[PDB]
């Protein structure tokens, strides 16, 4: 029996509180998934938080900047809540992120261009929010398999690079009135 990493545990508390997830080793239950890893110190095996999955829980909070302290995070799934305000730039510290699913919330603001640094992203579902600005951050997300930005306020055009993505099997940017497709 392993224990959860002390730092991940402390970060999880603040993240859940700010999301609105209401009430020691939370791994493997209630939306928290962990994986066995070598600890920074010691080298002994410890559990790290790798997935936060909180669909359909009537959450009304926000994504705390402390999300960036979960260095091993692979999945943040927050679909079908009432979460508000901006996607924090601190999520760029989650370099291993593969799944970012924020569909059907009320997230607002813009996505900064350096979101393209999340090179491992495979599933990016921002659909049905109130996000705005351009989609230049998609330029270098070459591993995307599932991409939806539908039903937002995005404008400009899809980056031409999307034409070269080889794994893209689901793509939706409908419901963005001032948004045009990728064109040369
Ligand atoms: C990614 O780019 C964004 C936008 O330029 C950066 O956001 C700024 O972050 C600093 C803290 O590092 C804040 O004080 C600023 O207010 C933010 N600006 C905006 C417009 O939100 C972000 O820091 C960049 N991150 C990385 C890793 O490059
Ligand atoms: Cl879920």
Numbering used by the authors: 34 to 56, 64 to 224
Source paper text:
The plant membrane receptor kinase SOBIR1 is a central regulator of plant immunity. It is required for signal transduction of conserved microbe-associated molecular patterns sensed by receptor-like proteins which lack cytoplasmic signalling domains. SOBIR1 and RLPs are likely to form heteromeric signalling complexes. The conserved GxxxG motifs in their transmembrane regions, but neither the SOBIR1 LRR ectodomain nor the kinase domain, are required for this interaction to occur in planta.
Here, we present the crystal structure of the SOBIR1 ectodomain from A. thaliana (AtSOBIR1) and discuss its implications for plant immune signalling. The model was refined against an isomorphous, high-resolution native data set at 1.55 Å resolution. However, both an active kinase domain and the SOBIR1 LRR ectodomain are required for signalling. The crystal structure of the SOBIR1 ectodomain reveals five LRRs sandwiched between unusual N-terminal and C-terminal capping domains. SERK1 shares the number of LRRs and the N-terminal capping domain with SOBIR1, but has a canonical, disulfide-bond-stabilized C-terminal cap. Analysis of the crystal packing with the PISA server revealed a rather small complex interface of ∼1000 Å2 formed by several salt bridges, hydrogen bonds and a few hydrophobic contacts. We next performed analytical size-exclusion chromatography and right-angle light-scattering experiments to assess the oligomeric state of the SOBIR1 extracellular domain in solution.
